[PDB]
Point group: C2
């Protein structure tokens, strides 16, 4: 079910930084020749229309803040609503007829763009809170929800200490170079 | 004799059934039990008071798209946040050391479609990180408050292999082993 690229940015949007980074990606990517659509997870979306957005998309970008160690409930509701709908388009089942091999959109990719209060050391230091599993380790279940559909991950981007050490200029440029590197 | 709070994430008769099993078993062991349905119009202040009352919090829930149903995550986002000043003070500034309810315990009781092998084999979907690995973020949200984990219970292949009974007996046994 997977056929420049079509990019779908899901804005999980302090609701300024995420709105700002959504805009940065929108402009950067469109100036690199891609076509992008932006959808706010915290909106009264049309699930069937959202399924079609995923079918249209070559890449899905999840721009979102870390809320209680993961996606805000509105983003998880978008997944629970949209992914479940789409059964038959985005995925057929869990694969068994190895769990996780029943997706129908292999070839599509997704990327996480995050903003957290926690410092990076909290993710990397074996002796700290997340026991060194890393940002992607903390997001394993989120990555896997996307992979169940058959999509592949692209390098994660994350801004840390956004509240205790804010610096939009830094984040914005770093994100831009992150995008140019991947989508350039 | 502990106060146990059970958050029923059913959205979903199996989880309703397992909530009942926990309630009946724990009370029979001398504990007081309270049940709250995550998928309801709960009052955030009331829930914070449930947490302060509880010695142990059991999260009974099905796995939805690799984790907690959105209604359970909204429960956390709503209640844990209202809990600022009672359940947690700050992020501790290392990060995660700013809880206010150290001494309390929490436990995950899960129901999944996937088979246990999908969690333990390094070459499978979950590269062998285990059930608790997949739930790392959920465990950590609880630990941020200062609470400590108890052994996780999980019923696998609950849809492809409806073994109710079996799941009820194993959970019942799991509970006696921990709270007995």
């Amino acid at each position: 079910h997977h056929h420049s690229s079509n990019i779908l940015i899901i804005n999980g949007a302090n609701g300024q930084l995420n709105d700002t980074l959504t805009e940065v990606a929108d402009g950067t990517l469109r100036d690199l020749g891609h076509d992008v659509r932006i959808v706010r997870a915290d909106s009264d979306y049309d699930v069937k229309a959202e399924v079609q957005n995923f079918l249209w998309a070559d890449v899905v970008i999840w721009q979102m803040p870390g809320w209680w160690m993961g996606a805000p409930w509105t983003v998880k509701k978008y997944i629970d609503d949209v992914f479940t709908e789409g059964h038959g388009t985005l995925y057929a089942s869990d694969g068994r007829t190895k769990y996780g091999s029943g997706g129908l959109v292999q070839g599509k990719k997704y990327m996480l763009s995050l903003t957290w209060n926690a410092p990076m050391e909290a993710f990397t230091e074996k002796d700290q809170f997340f026991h060194g599993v890393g940002v992607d380790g903390v997001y394993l279940p989120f990555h896997k929800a996307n992979q169940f559909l058959g999509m592949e991950p692209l390098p994660t981007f994350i801004a840390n200490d956004v509240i205790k050490m804010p610096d939009v200029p830094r984040y914005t440029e770093e994100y831009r170079k992150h995008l140019v590197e991947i989508f350039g």
